[PDB]
Design a binder for these strands. Structure first.
Length: 213
RNA sequence: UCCCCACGCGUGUGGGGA
């Protein structure tokens, strides 16, 4: 098949841009409207990442789709958007690549049955590693440890626990931006993995594994 | 976080979503 990458530069003057900036559910709904049909028909895995700001630079949202998106669904002036690019990962064994992944390292407690965030850099890096290896990739290892860094570890505001007429607890996920390098071990599998994304929260702008030299 | 589904002789796994 083929893939698509789209760069949205959001207008901080746009109330809708800001609406979606503030709420992943919104952003998800806005984005989802570019690949609606394929979405309905099970032909689409929407994936996106909101890039960390370089200061006065506009917020920038990277989006991957299995199918051709139509951004004419966007209100203007929502975002300066450049024509989507057809994507065709040329993966070969041994090929080394840089990667960026905002994710939610997690496990299900066999004890409680509940899905919980891992707590330590170690556990978080181990998770990312299990996930990459099962996914046809392999972390590169420098002279001291894995060639991988946690650029940020923050909480992502999701939604509020409905409480009777009073504001309840906040629901949020732990979002971990990994950056590093890795090599392809099984091309086709690595492609599956890239087309699917990695771990929970795809609906909130997690799971998008990007790769390039 | 909070929920749902699919599995598990492994101190759990994978998929979706708000």
């Amino acid at each position: 098949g083929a893939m698509w990458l789209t760069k949205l530069v959001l207008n901080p003057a746009s109330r809708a841009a800001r609406r979606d900036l503030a709420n992943p559910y919104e952003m998800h709904r806005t984005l989802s409207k570019a690949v609606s049909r394929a979405l309905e028909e099970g032909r689409e895995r929407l994936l996106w990442r909101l890039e960390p700001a370089r200061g006065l630079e506009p917020p920038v949202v990277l989006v991957q789709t299995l199918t051709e998106p139509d951004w004419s669904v966007l209100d203007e002036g929502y975002a300066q958007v450049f024509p989507p690019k057809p994507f065709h990962p040329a993966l070969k064994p041994g090929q080394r690549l840089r990667f960026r992944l905002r994710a939610n390292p997690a496990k299900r407690l066999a004890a409680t049955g509940k899905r919980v965030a891992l707590k330590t850099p170690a556990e978080k890096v181990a998770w990312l590693e299990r996930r990459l290896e099962e996914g046809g990739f392999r972390l590169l290892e420098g002279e001291r440890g894995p060639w991988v860094q946690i650029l940020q570890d923050t909480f992502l505001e999701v939604r509020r626990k409905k409480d009777g007429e009073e504001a309840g607890k906040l629901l949020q996920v732990q979002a971990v931006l990994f950056e590093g390098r890795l090599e392809v071990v099984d091309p086709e599998r690595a492609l599956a993995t890239l087309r699917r994304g990695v771990g929970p929260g795809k609906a909130l702008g997690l799971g998008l594994l990007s790769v390039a030299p």
